[PDB]
């Protein structure tokens, strides 16, 4: 029996949600191709690193992978949609913001040589710290782990010093002191037991930013029609399964930092006041940078 065989290398924790609907989209493409498609997940960076994943595509040294295209905003501007702050907080609205801006997005990746096939969000994104803050007098001078620009932009107007780090990589900058602070989920702060490190989470649902499932555009172009279609029934099961399982655990993960010591509690008056102040200097500048477009779709959004 004749088959191809792909490798996808992804960046998160093997038994992170994301990488298992990884193992889920390649059982999926698998039976939906009668077995002539056999992808093989790398989670956790081990084949290609998360900082490696979208040029690995680009270039076809991997057919498929899974990236964090936020993570490559500062190339396309337009991928920073996901971290607009404030404007989508909950998975509904996350999805009509996508719904809005998803042609252009699209559009952009195929100027990078890409097609997503699916994506995911993250659950809502929140503080984690080593110490109480209430605001912004409490975080000047912290070291902090940024995941893109605009994480690494909200620290900087918290005067805090941002250096950015994989996933993968987090436990061990935690342990050596690289950072003491970080925005993300309480996905990610489960599945690097960060309570080993940090204390606080403050809980602020300020966005929720995707992972896409990328092929290769010439591959793409080029696979039998069935075989396309069949990744394309594969990744919209996988990216409705993948979607309800991270809504399923948000709160379960929050639950898990509290049962191993975190104080986890909602952002204070105080403190929410200026990061609501913060994510609105945010959203203005990435409107200013994508220009017509992002009106566009913060307007189509609106509208839903
Ligand atoms: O919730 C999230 C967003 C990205 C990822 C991270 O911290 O790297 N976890
Ligand atoms: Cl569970």
Known sequence: ?????????????????????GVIFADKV??????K??????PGGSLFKGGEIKRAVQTGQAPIGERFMSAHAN?????????????????????????????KVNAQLADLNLVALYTCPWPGQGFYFKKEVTSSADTQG???RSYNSATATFAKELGMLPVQVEAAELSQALATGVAEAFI?????????????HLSHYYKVNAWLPRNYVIINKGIYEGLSDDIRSALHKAADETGAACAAKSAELANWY??????????????????????????????????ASVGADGQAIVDAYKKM
């Open 1 to 21: 029996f004749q088959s191809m065989k792909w490798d996808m290398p992804m960046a998160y924790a093997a038994t992170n949600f994301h990488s298992e609907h």
């Open 30 to 35: 698998k039976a939906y191709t009668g077995g």
């Open 37 to 42: 498609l056999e992808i093989t997940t790398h």
């Open 75 to 103: 190339e396309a501007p337009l991928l920073g949609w996901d971290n607009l702050p404030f404007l989508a907080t909950s998975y509904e609205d996350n999805d009509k913001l996508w719904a809005a801006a998803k042609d």
């Open 142 to 144: 912290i070291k902090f």
């Open 184 to 196: 993300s989920s309480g996905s990610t702060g489960y599945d690097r037991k960060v309570w080993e």
């Open 254 to 287: 929050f639950e898990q930092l509290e049962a191993n010591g975190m104080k986890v509690e909602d952002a204070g008056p105080a403190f929410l006041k200026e990061l609501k102040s913060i994510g609105a200097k945010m959203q203005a500048d990435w409107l």
